[PDB]
RNA sequence: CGCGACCUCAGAUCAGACGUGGCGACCCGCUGAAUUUAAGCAUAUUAGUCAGCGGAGGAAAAGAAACUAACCAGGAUUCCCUCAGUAACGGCGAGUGAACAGGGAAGAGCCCAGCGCCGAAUCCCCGCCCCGCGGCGGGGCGCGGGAAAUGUGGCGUACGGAAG
């Protein structure tokens, strides 16, 4: 498909974090906690969540 | 605060961390339009600095003025005068190019004010400058008492008048004995007051 | 055969009145008015010609809705009063 | 008789549209008896009807845009023509409120710093 | 030209009502100086733009 | 889901109408070409009245704004009489003069001594 | 093409000053408006000093001046501190401050010191609200009898 | 695959607003000549002037020092007298040419971002109640919707400031 300009450029916006060197410091990001350790924190910070209006 | 870090961080622009951020976000401007706006700062520390504060009613718009100097627009080569005036391809322009991107901004938002702007990126043939933009007649804009300054017709289109900072820097002002050839208002009021033959009553 | 046997072929004309100014200036291949410049959103106006300046600048006309403003500014905009009545 | 629009302001609506209605019929008849060629006192007496047309229609428009701006007293958003229509820039001034409104900032020094009330000896 | 546009039919509508002489029971008024109309215009030497 | 056509349109969206909260202008503007203001005078030159004598017409001077249909409804209300057809032109004066062609129920020179053209 | 003897000169009319030329024929008139807005600022402001705050003893800088002791810009915050008036009190009871000046001796210091010290016993402050009277106010018998001063307020002669 | 967040981005005759254009004496930004002078002329001069273009206001711009100084030191900006036809520039030819200081007109100072500490303490909009309404504003109630943590408000700004 003829994708429009924007669906193009935030795809091969991605493509190019996986072609250019990427530092580490951006690395880092990239390698993410795993899912069995997220929810469980998630359901530990669900405890202490701010306050609603 | 995260803003000194973020300030520091944009100071070291070598450093292979701002070279791999400032070419990713320059080919992607590259790849967008000459005009479009931008949803928020690229940059929210030089946007705070610079007096975007994050509310309804301030504007970032993301500008691509095209780089390089200026020749001078005349026919095929032909300045018709003396060998003074003969030049055309080695000329500069009086303005920053950040000014211009001010310039065009509010050009193309008329309804808006240009309160100030920074730069976001640059390669061989454009540079990409971030315009902060407050719409006068909202009323988190009009009701707020330090920044209903702006909405007073005195400030209508800053940025070709030449009052924001790109265009301050480019007047030739400030205090000084650098600055003699602008006392007065600015360097056509000093020109004024000074070629003017002040003819009193009785001499 | 540059003259008076040629201006015999004088009869397919260039302008017409244009519906800006009202002048006989608007062509009709550039479709464009000579005097106003008419398709331009701004009127054509210069400074070498005062004298095409001063045969209309806002004296020249009605002044429909400025003299108004004009009585109007002299007791400085009252508007949902009316007089006292008898 | 003569028309006045003092007593033509508590007459009602389809009343002032019939007396509307036979003044629009005899101006057209002046203006037969103008074409035809009729008499001075005709001729005298259009210009009458014109006017007595004229004070009807005031009348009317009067009556009308009264009412209209009585309807949107109270209300927030109001239509163009029952807006105040002062000049273009006056209309986009500040307002005597939104002017009047000074930062904390400021306030608390016109508290804590008033300007004073003074006078020096020679 | 018979083929005339609704414009320019109305202009020279205009230009020939204009074309009328001064009405007789104006010269006898207190602040005159009218003698005549001395805007006319006679089809043959005046040729009315357009 | 799939795509055939290799051609991205744009999606069809909701669009809503106008829901005003306040009317732009409050009341709507009389009609100032009405059935008086249409018809002005009828013409009683002679040439005008060989023709009400002669083929049941008669003949006014309207204004420039006006349709064929609306003079015809206006002579329709104003004299009470209906109308075969109607013929307009404008005079090299400026105003439209209408030939208003009656029924054969009705007869020109009695409506004319009825309005007062003779 | 000169003649025999005479000072050969350099006339700057070259450029076109026809075009650019101010005289003064609104000479009385700027002098008779701003005296009208003298007028009505000096009753506007009505037993206060005219002519605006009190400004200090302060010396001229070059070596052509340096004798010469003028009334400067306002009082520097080293000599209000030692005066003991607060840098936004004096504002408002009449004294111009500055906050750029420095002070490099002690004999320029004790004279403005001075000068603050008697302009404090010189003035007479009214009351906020009248019917009230506070204690740092002047007293009803000094509030009846206090009037504008003309001039310059304790003046600088040398 | 479907559902749900967020992010980038579109379409609305969506609700409410706003800019366009004119005059243009004075003002701000840019562009900007050649006549003319040099007894020719090319650098200069005319001249940052005319013409061109954009933008305002009742005034505009400037403005509270990355200043002047070199003194026993002054102290925002603007204007006037003077400095001074001086220092200086210039085929050092013709021509060009400021500022400091001093005296006067006037006189006024201030606010952010950052560093912080306060449960976002903040702002906009819809609906109803009361008041006032021809500068749509004040008070109350909404388990009303948004903005905002990618940072609003309060204290705080180089004259230091905050906490105890
Ligand atoms: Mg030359
Ligand atoms: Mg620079
Ligand atoms: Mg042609
Ligand atoms: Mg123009
Ligand atoms: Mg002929
Ligand atoms: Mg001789
Ligand atoms: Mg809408
Ligand atoms: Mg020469
Ligand atoms: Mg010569
Ligand atoms: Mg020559
Ligand atoms: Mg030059
Ligand atoms: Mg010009
Ligand atoms: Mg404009
Ligand atoms: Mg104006
Ligand atoms: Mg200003
Ligand atoms: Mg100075
Ligand atoms: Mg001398
Ligand atoms: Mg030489
Ligand atoms: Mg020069
Ligand atoms: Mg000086
Ligand atoms: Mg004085
Ligand atoms: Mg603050
Ligand atoms: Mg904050
Ligand atoms: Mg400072
Ligand atoms: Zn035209």
């Known amino acids: 498909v003829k994708w429009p300009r924007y669906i193009r450029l935030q795809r091969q916006r991605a493509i190019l974090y996986k072609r250019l060197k990427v530092p580490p410091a951006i690395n880092q990001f990239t390698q993410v906690l795993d899912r069995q350790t997220a929810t469980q924190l998630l359901k530990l910070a669900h405890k202490y969540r701010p306050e609603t209006k | 605060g995260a803003y000194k870090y973020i300030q520091e961080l944009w100071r070291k622009?070598?450093?292979?961390?701002?070279?791999?951020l400032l070419r990713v976000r320059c080919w992607q401007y590259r790849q967008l339009s000459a005009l479009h706006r931008a949803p928020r700062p690229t940059r929210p520390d030089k946007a705070r600095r610079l007096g975007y504060k994050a509310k309804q009613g301030y504007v970032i718009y993301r500008i691509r003025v095209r780089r390089g100097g200026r020749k001078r627009p005349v026919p095929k080569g032909a300045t018709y005068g003396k060998p003074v005036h003969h030049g055309v391809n080695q000329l500069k322009f009086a303005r920053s190019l950040q000014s211009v991107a001010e310039e065009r901004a509010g050009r193309h938002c008329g309804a808006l004010r240009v309160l100030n702007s920074y730069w976001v990126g640059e390669d061989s043939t454009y540079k990409f400058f971030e315009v902060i933009l407050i719409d006068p007649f909202h009323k988190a804009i009009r009701r707020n008492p330090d920044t209903q300054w702006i909405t007073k017709p005195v400030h209508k289109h800053r940025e070709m008048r030449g009052l924001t900072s790109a265009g301050r820097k480019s007047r030739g002002l400030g205090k000084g004995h650098k600055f003699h050839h602008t006392i007065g208002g600015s360097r056509r009021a000093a020109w004024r007051r000074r070629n003017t033959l002040q003819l009193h009553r009785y001499r | 055969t540059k003259g008076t046997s040629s201006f015999g072929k004088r009869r397919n004309k260039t302008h017409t009145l244009c519906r800006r100014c009202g002048s006989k200036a608007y062509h009709l291949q550039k479709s464009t008015c000579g005097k106003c410049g008419y398709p331009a959103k701004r009127k054509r106006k210069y400074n070498w010609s005062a004298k095409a300046k001063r045969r209309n600048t806002t004296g020249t006309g009605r002044m429909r809705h400025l003299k108004i403003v004009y009585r109007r500014f002299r007791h400085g905009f009252r508007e949902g009063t009316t007089p006292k009545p008898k | 008789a003569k028309i006045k629009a003092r007593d033509l302001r508590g007459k009602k609506k389809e009343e002032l549209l019939?007396?509307?209605?036979?003044?629009?019929?005899?101006?057209?008849?002046?203006?037969?008896?103008?074409?035809?060629?009729?008499?001075?006192?005709?001729?005298?007496?259009?210009?009458?009807?014109?006017?007595?047309?004229?004070?009807?229609?005031?009348?009317?428009?009067?009556?009308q845009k009264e009412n209209l701006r009585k309807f949107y007293k109270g209300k927030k958003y109001k239509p163009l023509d029952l807006r105040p229509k002062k000049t273009r820039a006056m209309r986009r001034r500040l307002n005597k409120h939104e002017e009047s409104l000074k930062t904390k900032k400021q306030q608390r020094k016109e508290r804590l710093y008033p300007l004073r009330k003074y006078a020096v000896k020679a | 030209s018979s083929h005339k546009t609704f414009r320019i039919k109305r202009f020279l509508a205009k230009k020939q009502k204009q074309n009328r002489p001064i009405p007789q029971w104006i010269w006898m008024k207190?602040?005159?100086?009218?003698?005549?109309?001395?805007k006319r215009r006679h089809w043959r030497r005046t040729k009315l733009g357009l | 889901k799939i795509r055939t056509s290799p051609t991205f349109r744009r999606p069809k969206t909701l669009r809503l109408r106008r829901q005003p909260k306040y009317p732009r202008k409050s009341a709507p503007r009389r009609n100032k070409l009405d059935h008086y203001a249409?018809?002005?005078?009828?013409?009683?030159?002679?040439?005008?009245?060989?023709?009400?004598?002669?083929?049941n017409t008669l003949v006014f001077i309207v204004d420039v704004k006006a349709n064929k249909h609306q003079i015809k409804q206006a002579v329709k209300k104003l004299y009470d009489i209906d109308v075969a057809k109607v013929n307009t032109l404008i005079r090299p004066d400026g105003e439209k003069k209408a030939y208003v062609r009656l029924a054969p129920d009705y007869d020109a020179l009695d409506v004319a001594n009825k309005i007062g053209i003779i | 093409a000169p003649s025999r003897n005479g000072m050969i000169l350099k006339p700057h009319f070259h450029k076109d000053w026809q075009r650019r030329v101010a005289t003064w024929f609104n000479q009385p008139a700027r002098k008779?408006?701003?005296?009208?807005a003298r007028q009505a600022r000096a009753r506007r402001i009505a037993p206060?000093?005219?002519?605006?705050?009190?400004?200090?003893?302060?010396?001229?800088?070059?070596?052509?001046?340096?004798?010469?002791?003028?009334?400067?810009?306002?009082?520097?915050?080293?000599?209000?501190?030692?005066?003991?008036?607060?840098?936004?009190?004096?504002?408002?009871?009449?004294?111009?401050?500055?906050?750029?000046?420095?002070?490099?001796?002690?004999?320029?210091?004790?004279?403005?010191?001075?000068?603050?010290?008697?302009?404090?016993?010189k003035l007479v402050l009214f009351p906020r609200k009248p019917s009230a009277p506070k204690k740092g106010?002047?007293?009803?018998?000094?509030?009846?009898?206090?009037?504008?001063?003309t001039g310059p307020v304790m003046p600088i002669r040398n």
């Open chain 2, 13 to 20: 622009k070598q450093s292979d961390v701002m070279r791999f």
């Open chain 4, 18 to 63: 019939k007396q509307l209605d036979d003044l629009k019929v005899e101006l057209s008849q002046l203006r037969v008896a103008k074409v035809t060629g009729g008499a001075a006192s005709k001729l005298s007496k259009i210009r009458v009807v014109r006017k007595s047309i004229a004070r009807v229609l005031t009348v009317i428009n009067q009556t």
């Open chain 5, 30 to 38: 207190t602040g005159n100086k009218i003698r005549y109309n001395s």
């Open chain 6, 38 to 55: 249409i018809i002005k005078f009828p013409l009683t030159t002679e040439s005008a009245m060989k023709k009400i004598e002669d083929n």
């Open chain 7, 32 to 36: 008779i408006r701003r005296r009208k």
């Open chain 7, 48 to 121: 206060r000093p005219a002519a605006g705050p009190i400004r200090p003893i302060v010396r001229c800088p070059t070596v052509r001046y340096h004798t010469k002791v003028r009334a400067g810009r306002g009082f520097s915050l080293e000599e209000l501190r030692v005066a003991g008036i607060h840098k936004k009190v004096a504002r408002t009871i009449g004294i111009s401050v500055d906050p750029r000046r420095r002070n490099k001796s002690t004999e320029s210091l004790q004279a403005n010191v001075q000068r603050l010290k008697e302009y404090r016993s």
């Open chain 7, 137 to 149: 106010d002047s007293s009803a018998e000094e509030l009846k009898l206090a009037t504008q001063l």
